[PDB]
Amino acid sequence: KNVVIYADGVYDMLHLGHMKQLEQAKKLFENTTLIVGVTSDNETKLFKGQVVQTLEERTETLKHIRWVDEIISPCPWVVTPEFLEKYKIDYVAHDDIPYDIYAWLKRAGKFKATQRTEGVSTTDLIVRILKNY
Amino acid sequence: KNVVIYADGVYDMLHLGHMKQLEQAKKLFENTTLIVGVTSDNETKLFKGQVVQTLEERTETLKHIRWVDEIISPCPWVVTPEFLEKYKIDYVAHDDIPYDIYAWLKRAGKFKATQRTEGVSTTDLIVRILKNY
Numbered sequence A, B: 001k002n003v004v005i006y007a008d009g010v011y012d013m014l015h016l017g018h019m020k021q022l023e024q025a026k027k028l029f030e031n032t033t034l035i036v037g038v039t040s041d042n043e044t045k046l047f048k049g050q051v052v053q054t055l056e057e058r059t060e061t062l063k064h065i066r067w068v069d070e071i072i073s074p075c076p077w078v079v080t081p082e083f084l085e086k087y088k089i090d091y092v093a094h095d096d097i098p099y100d101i102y103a104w105l106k107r108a109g110k111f112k113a114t115q116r117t118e119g120v121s122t123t124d125l126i127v128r129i130l131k132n133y
């Protein structure tokens, strides 16, 4: 009955959007283990761009989040069939918002969609602070 | 054996410092319920000063934190003996960093000290972003 869910990401400056996404992945089935992968500094810079917090800082914040059961830090940038078998992962939870490399997961019945929440990012709150001066 | 711990605070723009403090309060005894109080917007402004996030925003983030068992939102600004009895609270966890109104708790054996962690605040990270331009 226990289902292993994997979600990966940068988790830079963790905000309520990340946390709601993690909650959604945790709650995809009644009984889950949610494994979170945290991307390396070098690979995040190479493929996505700047990152504000180091791998160690992004990983430490994640350990305080209720929905996170296990952490792979750092995690590989691209998910592979071999990775799923190594960690006995039953489903990969993704927002399907580009960053379709995941078609093979959908084909296999192993893709579970999650959503984002806008207007909650750390960035947006400095904007809220500054719109008082 | 279960001990009810109460920690209150603003919890504005929650960062790793808050989370480590909550972890410390949760882990003060083997078996605890950690109740977190979140201060009202009006009282935080009157007594401490500006607050960036609303009560609802600060409370929602807290529900995602692993160590938080129950939330009183909003909570009273000053802890009273009557409040401890109403909620069956065994100890109040505070950093003892001023903001001694807590002498009566120390007298009663109900004060448990927790510590802060500097350099982790949301504020500090924009400073880290800006020191690249």
Ligand SMILES: NCc1ccnc(N)c1
Binding pocket: A008, A009, A010, A039, A048, A076, A077, A078, A099
């Ligand atoms: N490692 C995959 C990945 C990378 C960046 N952002 C994501 N959401 C997922």
Ligand SMILES: NCc1ccnc(N)c1
Binding pocket: A017, A018, A021, A115, A116, A117, A118, A119, A121
């Ligand atoms: N940066 C990833 C992410 C996750 C959830 N919500 C967002 N708005 C963004």
Ligand SMILES: NCc1ccnc(N)c1
Binding pocket: B008, B009, B010, B039, B048, B076, B077, B078, B099
């Ligand atoms: N409600 C008490 C209080 C108010 C502000 N900051 C704290 N840490 C505690």
Ligand SMILES: NCc1ccnc(N)c1
Binding pocket: B017, B018, B021, B115, B116, B117, B118, B119, B121
């Ligand atoms: N603002 C309260 C607080 C809690 C923990 N650590 C800090 N540095 C500050």
